[PDB]
Design an enzyme around this catalytic site. Structure first.
Site, mmCIF file in Angstrom:
data_model
loop_
_atom_site.group_PDB
_atom_site.id
_atom_site.type_symbol
_atom_site.label_atom_id
_atom_site.label_comp_id
_atom_site.label_asym_id
_atom_site.label_seq_id
_atom_site.Cartn_x
_atom_site.Cartn_y
_atom_site.Cartn_z
ATOM 1 N N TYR B 140 -25.688 -48.707 -26.467
ATOM 2 C CA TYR B 140 -25.484 -47.830 -25.297
ATOM 3 C C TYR B 140 -25.688 -48.513 -23.971
ATOM 4 N N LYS B 186 -28.970 -51.229 -40.375
ATOM 5 C CA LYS B 186 -27.989 -51.940 -41.226
ATOM 6 C C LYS B 186 -28.391 -53.446 -41.401
ATOM 7 N N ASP B 218 -25.713 -46.154 -44.033
ATOM 8 C CA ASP B 218 -24.711 -45.438 -44.861
ATOM 9 C C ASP B 218 -25.367 -44.676 -45.983
ATOM 10 N N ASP B 242 -27.772 -40.848 -32.921
ATOM 11 C CA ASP B 242 -26.686 -39.945 -32.488
ATOM 12 C C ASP B 242 -25.889 -39.299 -33.671
ATOM 13 N N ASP B 246 -26.172 -35.259 -35.416
ATOM 14 C CA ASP B 246 -25.085 -34.275 -35.584
ATOM 15 C C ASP B 246 -24.937 -33.901 -37.069
HETATM 16 N N1 LIG Z 1 -20.401 -53.572 -52.233
HETATM 17 C C1 LIG Z 1 -21.711 -53.934 -52.326
HETATM 18 O O1 LIG Z 1 -22.016 -55.022 -52.863
HETATM 19 C C2 LIG Z 1 -22.785 -53.085 -51.765
HETATM 20 C C3 LIG Z 1 -22.608 -51.829 -51.047
HETATM 21 C C4 LIG Z 1 -23.771 -51.151 -50.568
HETATM 22 C C5 LIG Z 1 -25.041 -51.755 -50.772
HETATM 23 N N2 LIG Z 1 -25.132 -52.973 -51.361
HETATM 24 C C6 LIG Z 1 -26.456 -53.566 -51.647
HETATM 25 O O2 LIG Z 1 -26.933 -52.642 -52.642
HETATM 26 C C7 LIG Z 1 -28.373 -52.517 -52.656
HETATM 27 C C8 LIG Z 1 -28.883 -51.013 -52.654
HETATM 28 O O3 LIG Z 1 -28.729 -50.583 -51.264
HETATM 29 P P1 LIG Z 1 -28.594 -49.024 -51.162
HETATM 30 O O4 LIG Z 1 -29.742 -48.242 -51.820
HETATM 31 O O5 LIG Z 1 -28.589 -48.670 -49.663
HETATM 32 O O6 LIG Z 1 -27.110 -48.574 -51.691
HETATM 33 P P2 LIG Z 1 -26.705 -48.102 -53.200
HETATM 34 O O7 LIG Z 1 -25.247 -47.682 -52.877
HETATM 35 O O8 LIG Z 1 -26.814 -49.292 -54.104
HETATM 36 O O9 LIG Z 1 -27.543 -46.862 -53.721
HETATM 37 C C9 LIG Z 1 -27.538 -45.700 -52.842
HETATM 38 C C10 LIG Z 1 -28.162 -44.527 -53.695
HETATM 39 O O10 LIG Z 1 -27.193 -44.073 -54.640
HETATM 40 C C11 LIG Z 1 -27.626 -44.319 -55.986
HETATM 41 N N3 LIG Z 1 -26.437 -44.941 -56.648
HETATM 42 C C12 LIG Z 1 -25.568 -45.870 -56.156
HETATM 43 N N4 LIG Z 1 -24.632 -46.164 -57.072
HETATM 44 C C13 LIG Z 1 -24.821 -45.352 -58.117
HETATM 45 C C14 LIG Z 1 -24.201 -45.148 -59.385
HETATM 46 N N5 LIG Z 1 -23.039 -45.811 -59.820
HETATM 47 N N6 LIG Z 1 -24.802 -44.284 -60.184
HETATM 48 C C15 LIG Z 1 -25.878 -43.549 -59.924
HETATM 49 N N7 LIG Z 1 -26.471 -43.671 -58.739
HETATM 50 C C16 LIG Z 1 -25.972 -44.556 -57.838
HETATM 51 C C17 LIG Z 1 -28.692 -45.450 -55.836
HETATM 52 O O11 LIG Z 1 -29.609 -45.359 -56.943
HETATM 53 C C18 LIG Z 1 -29.405 -45.015 -54.531
HETATM 54 O O12 LIG Z 1 -30.224 -43.881 -54.826
HETATM 55 C C19 LIG Z 1 -28.780 -53.345 -51.375
HETATM 56 O O13 LIG Z 1 -29.085 -54.723 -51.736
HETATM 57 C C20 LIG Z 1 -27.489 -53.322 -50.524
HETATM 58 O O14 LIG Z 1 -27.386 -54.420 -49.631
HETATM 59 C C21 LIG Z 1 -24.076 -53.634 -51.858
HETATM 60 N N1 LIG Z 2 -25.683 -33.962 -24.443
HETATM 61 C C1 LIG Z 2 -24.408 -33.906 -23.938
HETATM 62 O O1 LIG Z 2 -24.197 -33.610 -22.762
HETATM 63 C C2 LIG Z 2 -23.268 -34.117 -24.892
HETATM 64 C C3 LIG Z 2 -23.504 -34.287 -26.316
HETATM 65 C C4 LIG Z 2 -22.348 -34.459 -27.186
HETATM 66 C C5 LIG Z 2 -21.076 -34.415 -26.571
HETATM 67 N N2 LIG Z 2 -20.915 -34.310 -25.218
HETATM 68 C C6 LIG Z 2 -19.608 -34.209 -24.599
HETATM 69 O O2 LIG Z 2 -19.164 -32.863 -24.954
HETATM 70 C C7 LIG Z 2 -17.694 -32.813 -25.024
HETATM 71 C C8 LIG Z 2 -17.169 -32.363 -26.431
HETATM 72 O O3 LIG Z 2 -17.482 -33.403 -27.385
HETATM 73 P P1 LIG Z 2 -17.451 -32.928 -28.921
HETATM 74 O O4 LIG Z 2 -16.391 -31.888 -29.218
HETATM 75 O O5 LIG Z 2 -17.532 -34.188 -29.799
HETATM 76 O O6 LIG Z 2 -18.930 -32.356 -29.118
HETATM 77 P P2 LIG Z 2 -19.546 -30.835 -29.063
HETATM 78 O O7 LIG Z 2 -20.923 -31.106 -29.675
HETATM 79 O O8 LIG Z 2 -19.412 -30.325 -27.662
HETATM 80 O O9 LIG Z 2 -18.749 -29.822 -30.044
HETATM 81 C C9 LIG Z 2 -18.603 -30.315 -31.364
HETATM 82 C C10 LIG Z 2 -18.119 -29.055 -32.133
HETATM 83 O O10 LIG Z 2 -19.161 -28.106 -32.363
HETATM 84 C C11 LIG Z 2 -18.885 -26.831 -31.687
HETATM 85 N N3 LIG Z 2 -20.136 -26.458 -30.925
HETATM 86 C C12 LIG Z 2 -20.965 -27.278 -30.175
HETATM 87 N N4 LIG Z 2 -21.963 -26.609 -29.633
HETATM 88 C C13 LIG Z 2 -21.805 -25.298 -29.997
HETATM 89 C C14 LIG Z 2 -22.503 -24.101 -29.747
HETATM 90 N N5 LIG Z 2 -23.645 -24.090 -28.934
HETATM 91 N N6 LIG Z 2 -22.025 -22.974 -30.316
HETATM 92 C C15 LIG Z 2 -20.935 -22.908 -31.094
HETATM 93 N N7 LIG Z 2 -20.210 -24.002 -31.340
HETATM 94 C C16 LIG Z 2 -20.615 -25.196 -30.811
HETATM 95 C C17 LIG Z 2 -17.780 -27.140 -30.675
HETATM 96 O O11 LIG Z 2 -16.970 -26.034 -30.220
HETATM 97 C C18 LIG Z 2 -16.993 -28.273 -31.417
HETATM 98 O O12 LIG Z 2 -16.238 -27.747 -32.503
HETATM 99 C C19 LIG Z 2 -17.205 -34.241 -24.661
HETATM 100 O O13 LIG Z 2 -16.944 -34.284 -23.248
HETATM 101 C C20 LIG Z 2 -18.436 -35.118 -25.070
HETATM 102 O O14 LIG Z 2 -18.531 -36.347 -24.356
HETATM 103 C C21 LIG Z 2 -21.963 -34.140 -24.371
HETATM 104 C C1 LIG Z 3 -23.743 -37.721 -23.578
HETATM 105 C C2 LIG Z 3 -23.892 -38.774 -24.680
HETATM 106 C C3 LIG Z 3 -24.440 -40.098 -24.073
HETATM 107 C C4 LIG Z 3 -24.701 -38.317 -25.952
HETATM 108 C C5 LIG Z 3 -25.245 -39.496 -26.719
HETATM 109 O O1 LIG Z 3 -24.441 -40.185 -27.537
HETATM 110 O O2 LIG Z 3 -26.411 -39.794 -26.489
HETATM 111 C C6 LIG Z 3 -24.228 -37.165 -26.865
HETATM 112 O O3 LIG Z 3 -23.805 -37.377 -28.348
HETATM 113 C C7 LIG Z 3 -25.567 -36.759 -27.027
HETATM 114 O O4 LIG Z 3 -25.842 -36.677 -28.393
HETATM 115 O O5 LIG Z 3 -26.298 -36.727 -25.953
HETATM 116 C C1 LIG Z 4 -22.169 -55.477 -48.893
HETATM 117 C C2 LIG Z 4 -21.876 -54.830 -47.477
HETATM 118 C C3 LIG Z 4 -21.257 -55.869 -46.525
HETATM 119 C C4 LIG Z 4 -21.068 -53.520 -47.499
HETATM 120 C C5 LIG Z 4 -20.462 -53.120 -46.152
HETATM 121 O O1 LIG Z 4 -21.321 -52.608 -45.305
HETATM 122 O O2 LIG Z 4 -19.248 -53.312 -45.979
HETATM 123 C C6 LIG Z 4 -21.580 -52.233 -48.248
HETATM 124 O O3 LIG Z 4 -22.100 -50.898 -47.613
HETATM 125 C C7 LIG Z 4 -20.260 -51.873 -48.509
HETATM 126 O O4 LIG Z 4 -20.094 -50.522 -48.179
HETATM 127 O O5 LIG Z 4 -19.517 -52.856 -48.938
HETATM 128 MN MN LIG Z 5 -24.217 -36.747 -30.279
HETATM 129 MN MN LIG Z 6 -21.684 -48.853 -47.455
#
Ligand SMILES: NC(=O)c1ccc[n+]([C@@H]2O[C@H](COP(=O)([O-])OP(=O)(O)OC[C@H]3O[C@@H](n4cnc5c(N)ncnc54)[C@H](O)[C@@H]3O)[C@@H](O)[C@H]2O)c1
Ligand SMILES: NC(=O)c1ccc[n+]([C@@H]2O[C@H](COP(=O)([O-])OP(=O)(O)OC[C@H]3O[C@@H](n4cnc5c(N)ncnc54)[C@H](O)[C@@H]3O)[C@@H](O)[C@H]2O)c1
Ligand SMILES: CC(C)[C@H](C(=O)O)[C@@H](O)C(=O)O
Ligand SMILES: CC(C)[C@H](C(=O)O)[C@@H](O)C(=O)O
Ligand SMILES: [Mn+2]
Ligand SMILES: [Mn+2]
Ligand SMILES: [K+]
Ligand SMILES: [K+]
Ligand SMILES: [K+]
Ligand SMILES: [K+]
Lengths: 350, 350
Positions: B140, B186, B218, B242, B246
């Site tokens: 940011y 990450k 992720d 952020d 959401d």
């Molecule tokens: N393409 C890749 O090689 C790849 C992608 C993501 C993460 N990684 C590596 O994997 C390791 C684990 O990281 P992580 O926990 O964030 O991601 P993960 O995707 O390996 O696991 C995420 C969650 O989902 C569950 N899970 C994932 N695959 C599953 C399957 N086939 N069956 C049942 N459960 C499943 C895991 O037990 C964990 O609870 C780290 O070393 C990361 O860097 C590798």
């Molecule tokens: N803190 C901030 O001022 C802030 C935060 C996020 C986005 N923004 C700005 O707001 C504008 C819209 O962005 P966006 O559409 O991604 O985000 P948004 O969060 O304004 O709306 C996302 C979605 O949720 C719904 N929603 C949000 N607040 C709601 C409420 N109080 N009640 C019912 N429905 C609601 C909206 O109608 C839309 O479908 C852009 O100009 C963006 O830059 C500002």
């Molecule tokens: C207005 C903008 C900078 C903001 C952010 O990304 O911080 C929006 O998503 C929020 O969540 O305040």
């Molecule tokens: C192993 C790593 C670089 C990878 C990525 O972030 O691309 C993992 O989350 C994936 O989704 O492949």
């Molecule tokens: Mn936001």
């Molecule tokens: Mn991934």
């Protein structure tokens, strides 16, 4: 011929990849595919043997193959290694060296399987989304990057041609699907989001048969869980695609389900979205669906075998109903679940 | 003495801020709080009158106030402005000029309101999560940053002291809650993630009574939706916080529900997580829950009125049961919903 370099990697990687090989061997025997695969060391397994995660013989195997079937790399055993030889740097290198800039990560809820989602049934029903993630640019590869004692830094950088070519893939995918693209960025805070958005909008002009919308990444993450049936193709950069695709796993209901393809200039790579899951590695429980469906994506995208890929998806879906694995509320571990898949595949043939 | 600077902003910002003011006025009348507020231009409204989103009289008001109640900024009317004066940059300058580094974004599913979630009841039940997001650093604010015809760049970066002070806040919050911190990064791909992880781990050694766990962003997005009840405090950087906040709105069921506090060296700011929602601005329907609960967080964090914060939270809960707004499947517009909160507040006053 079907020449496949197999990179099982670490943790559950070998467990799920073996399950995927059983399905491929079964198809090869049934169909005469001329399947020829070789297994190569990759990630932590390669580090333990060669001191680097993507060693020479593996680079050569990838280079000479028609496709790569990949498991997963990484785990606590390799925590703390310098970054340039960490298991995940090996996968970055593989992607970059093959210029695989387009990462396809689909998430679908099969009819009848809505019950597997943590989402209410009516929300999961009919969901069919495709994430097109930019895979070789952005913060993952941007320079400068580094750390001192005082601070660390990484650079999210995109050029025009990099955004153009991934945007083209998304629009061409949307043509084949339901003609909708949502592009995802943080353009309200980041120059690079603005640049991304303008460039995707420019490419969109050449596809008047496809609808284009933009969403901020924070709102997109909410919309994808609250209203997933709304989305067809979702195009985004490297780190936001990584996040939205693990999130997309909650639509069909588990990260054990999600396949992927990485396509570009060089040898295409097919691997589960999931990692190496060290918490369950070696327990025989890992859901092999994501590996099996990545082998199906390989059949379709690398080999043009669209109908075989579809039989695999169908037998997976049946197996999911009959004998769910533990990550989806059942008790079928990896070998029992794959066996259910193979029986449905035999039932569809024999 | 309760001196408050009110920054209603754009779109639904004034609508929901007005409802929060009605709630604060009823508390002031019932409790004699010495509430003294003034309304200042901010965001797009400040741009049109003064040429910048955080103009001088609003800067002066923030400085002289004990707290800020802020609505939302932004909308298509200001698209294309130089970044320096965009509505959102006005909110960045507010945060940075007051050095508000700790963004507190809570997500709870109140008992009996699980059915409002799009998640199945058993998943939403008991959820009580606090995201602590670093608000003044990271991509940011990182330099260098820019855009040409050929490319654009932003720098994700963090210094040791910025990571430390936000980690400390997370551990101190965990001590008042259930003593569990997950730190989100990450680190497997990003130097900044590794630096973050190392630093949070170092801070955590002072709090051995707090469990500390690390998740990649992720896998955390996925876990937050599948297993939200397992989390207490989640600490993370600017952009990841952020996004996850959401996403957290799907737990109680709507982005219209989530409040936030921004705390640090200067005047604390309290505002909804949500934006200006231009697609519903002026329709009289915006859910004011987030603004009302942001006034509650203000009463707690800026004024030490914890008991009054809880009464407001209880009247909001009951309003959501009796007369839900349209973002939660009911028909109560902004004024009708607020009137229900006021009826419950006046009953509690007895
Ligand atoms: N393409 C890749 O090689 C790849 C992608 C993501 C993460 N990684 C590596 O994997 C390791 C684990 O990281 P992580 O926990 O964030 O991601 P993960 O995707 O390996 O696991 C995420 C969650 O989902 C569950 N899970 C994932 N695959 C599953 C399957 N086939 N069956 C049942 N459960 C499943 C895991 O037990 C964990 O609870 C780290 O070393 C990361 O860097 C590798
Ligand atoms: N803190 C901030 O001022 C802030 C935060 C996020 C986005 N923004 C700005 O707001 C504008 C819209 O962005 P966006 O559409 O991604 O985000 P948004 O969060 O304004 O709306 C996302 C979605 O949720 C719904 N929603 C949000 N607040 C709601 C409420 N109080 N009640 C019912 N429905 C609601 C909206 O109608 C839309 O479908 C852009 O100009 C963006 O830059 C500002
Ligand atoms: C207005 C903008 C900078 C903001 C952010 O990304 O911080 C929006 O998503 C929020 O969540 O305040
Ligand atoms: C192993 C790593 C670089 C990878 C990525 O972030 O691309 C993992 O989350 C994936 O989704 O492949
Ligand atoms: Mn936001
Ligand atoms: Mn991934
Ligand atoms: K994988
Ligand atoms: K090749
Ligand atoms: K807001
Ligand atoms: K002050």
């Amino acid at each position: 011929s079907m020449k496949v370099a197999v990179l099982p990697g670490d943790g559950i990687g070998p467990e799920v990849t073996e399950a995927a090989l059983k399905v491929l061997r079964a198809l090869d025997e049934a169909e005469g595919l001329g399947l020829a695969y070789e297994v190569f060391p990759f990630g932590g397994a390669a580090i333990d043997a060669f001191g680097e995660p993507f060693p020479e013989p593996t680079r050569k195997g990838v280079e000479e193959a028609e496709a790569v079937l990949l498991g997963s790399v990484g785990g606590p055993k390799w925590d703390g290694l310098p970054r340039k030889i960490r298991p995940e740097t090996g996968l970055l290198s593989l992607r970059k060296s093959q210029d695989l800039f387009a990462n396809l990560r689909p998430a679908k809820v099969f009819p009848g399987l809505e019950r597997l989602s943590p989402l209410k049934e009516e929300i999961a029903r009919g969901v069919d989304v495709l994430i097109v993630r930019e895979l070789t640019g952005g913060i993952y590869f941007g320079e400068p990057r580094g750390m001192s004692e005082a601070e660390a830094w990484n650079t999210e950088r995109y050029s025009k041609p990099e955004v153009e070519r991934v945007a083209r893939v998304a629009f061409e995918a949307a043509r084949k699907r339901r003609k909708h693209v949502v592009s995802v960025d943080k353009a309200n805070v980041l120059e690079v989001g603005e640049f991304w958005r303008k460039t995707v909008e420019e490419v969109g002009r050449g596809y008047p048969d496809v609808a284009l919308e933009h969403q901020y990444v924070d709102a997109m993450a909410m919309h994808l869980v609250r209203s997933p049936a709304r989305f067809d193709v979702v195009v985004t950069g490297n780190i936001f695609g990584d996040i939205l695709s693990d999130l997309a796993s909650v639509l069909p209901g588990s990260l054990g389900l999600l396949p992927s393809a990485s396509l570009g200039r060089g040898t295409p790579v097919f691997e589960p979205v999931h990692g190496s899951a060290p918490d369950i590695a070696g327990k025989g429980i890992a859901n092999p669906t994501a590996a099996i469906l990545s082998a199906a994506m390989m059949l379709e995208h690398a080999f043009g075998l669209v109908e075989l890929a579809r039989k695999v998806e169908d037998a997976v879906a049946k197996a999911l109903l009959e004998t769910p694995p533990p990550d989806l509320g059942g008790s079928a571990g990896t070998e029992a679940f794959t066996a259910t898949v193979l029986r449905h595949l035999a039932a569809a043939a024999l």
